Nucleic acid binder design. Structure first.
Lengths: 243, 158
DNA sequence: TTTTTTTTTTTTTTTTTT
DNA sequence: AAAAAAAAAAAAAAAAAAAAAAAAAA
């Protein structure tokens, strides 16, 4: 049962095996990470674990500019040059897709609703943690298999969720009047941290020599357009945070 | 409105983060099974539409893929809501026996190419529940005995 | 030499437009 | 202050899923 102490014993054991033993064989790492995630997501939100695993992927694989020396091997031991490059990326992006579906469901029920304030606080907390998670992965160099287009699709989903969130903010801003401060920090983090490195990643994948990249640039420009309309109808300048 | 409810319930049950926020909502499944309880008194107007919803849920969401979660678990759960509608409606409404029971049999006998395990489950439930209440609506059974030759063998055994 | 996995293709289902 | 092609039935397109083929590893 997911509230039992034996659940927590099993989760601690799984996490300890994940923190010690290397085992360079893709299927073993994939099934063990799937066991860990399956246990974790029925206990609490996985975004911390996704963040740490993105840090490990960034430390192992490296950066696009080839002058960033980052190694964070302390986090999770089941991360290898032959493991983390093909297999772990797809799993962490799939779980991130699941968390984006969950906040999409919350956003749609919050739009249909108009229980109010802690809901949106948890939503922007998950979005901020996922934003730092995505920030760690966009700077990396992935192989040109399914991984890169999966990253583009999930980034399109991230920007789509942000667009739907500021759409709900456009719906709600007339009745109350004002934006909560955590949303202001979130839109600062999305403007400053994510989108410039997203552009740099598009340049990085384009320079090395057809549908997802138009989808992504359309998603980010729609995000910016809805942000224009919000910054007009909110009496606050959110483009000084933007680049 | 029933399939959406089961999608929502599957999404919450798979994740604790949504269990913390959303306070436990009654779902359309529990509301429908409350309607069937409520209809006992005088609501005969309702119950001929309960029977049609039952067989629309079972007819539309029954298996085919064996002759996955999203194509399976909110369609398995709707098709088993159907049989629950028809089995609870069969028990209390003493006049839409022979309208469920000749239509269950009419789907078991005549289809026999498309998978019909769900109707044999429902017919097993309906019979097993009370053959004491089926000896007042029995001739609908013994008219499907005359069609037993032309069926495939597994359907005859089942 | 065989078994498994991955990739591609086809078919079916649902939605949106005339 | 600006936004749309929705207009009872049918058809076409898109998306997803399942199956088949091919390639690789022991």
């Amino acid at each position: 049962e997911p509230s039992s102490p034996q659940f927590v014993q099993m989760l601690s054991w799984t996490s300890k095996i994940c923190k010690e033993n290397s085992r360079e064989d893709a299927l073993f790492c994939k099934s063990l990470m799937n066991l860990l995630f399956s246990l974790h997501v029925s206990y609490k939100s996985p975004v911390i674990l996704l963040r740490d695993l993105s840090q490990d992927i960034h430390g192992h694989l490296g950066d696009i500019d080839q002058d960033v020396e980052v190694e964070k091997t302390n986090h999770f031991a089941i991360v290898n040059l032959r493991t983390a490059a093909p297999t772990v990326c797809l799993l962490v992006l799939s779980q991130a897709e699941k968390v984006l579906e969950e906040v999409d469901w919350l956003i749609t029920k919050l739009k249909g609703q108009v229980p109010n304030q802690p809901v949106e606080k948890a939503i922007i907390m998950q979005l901020g943690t996922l934003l730092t998670f995505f920030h760690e992965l966009v700077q990396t160099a992935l192989p040109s298999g399914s991984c890169v287009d999966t990253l583009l699709k999930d980034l399109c989903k991230m920007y789509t969720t942000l667009t739907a969130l500021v759409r709900y903010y456009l719906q709600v801003c007339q009745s109350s009047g004002g934006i909560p401060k955590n949303m202001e920090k979130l839109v600062k983090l999305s403007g400053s941290h994510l989108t410039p490195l997203c552009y740099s990643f598009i340049s990085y994948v384009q320079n090395k020599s057809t549908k997802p990249i138009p989808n992504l640039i359309f998603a980010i420009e729609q995000y910016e357009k809805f942000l224009i309309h919000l910054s007009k109808k909110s009496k606050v300048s959110l483009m000084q945070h933007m680049k | 409105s029933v399939v959406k409810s089961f999608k929502d319930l599957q999404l919450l049950q798979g994740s604790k983060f949504l269990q913390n926020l959303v306070p436990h909502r009654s779902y359309v499944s529990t509301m429908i099974l409350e309607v069937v309880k409520n209809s006992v008194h005088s609501w005969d107007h309702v119950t001929q539409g309960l029977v049609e919803l039952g067989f629309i849920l079972m007819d539309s969401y029954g298996p085919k893929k064996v002759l996955p979660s999203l194509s399976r678990m909110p369609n398995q759960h709707a098709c088993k809501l159907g049989a629950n509608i028809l089995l609870e409606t069969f028990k209390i409404h003493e006049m839409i026996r022979q309208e469920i029971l000749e239509q269950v049999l009419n789907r078991v006998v005549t289809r026999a190419s498309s998978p019909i395990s769900h109707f044999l489950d429902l017919l097993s439930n309906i019979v097993m529940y009370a053959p004491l209440v089926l000896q007042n609506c029995s001739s609908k059974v013994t008219e499907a005995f005359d069609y037993l030759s032309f069926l495939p063998l597994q359907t005859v055994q089942r």
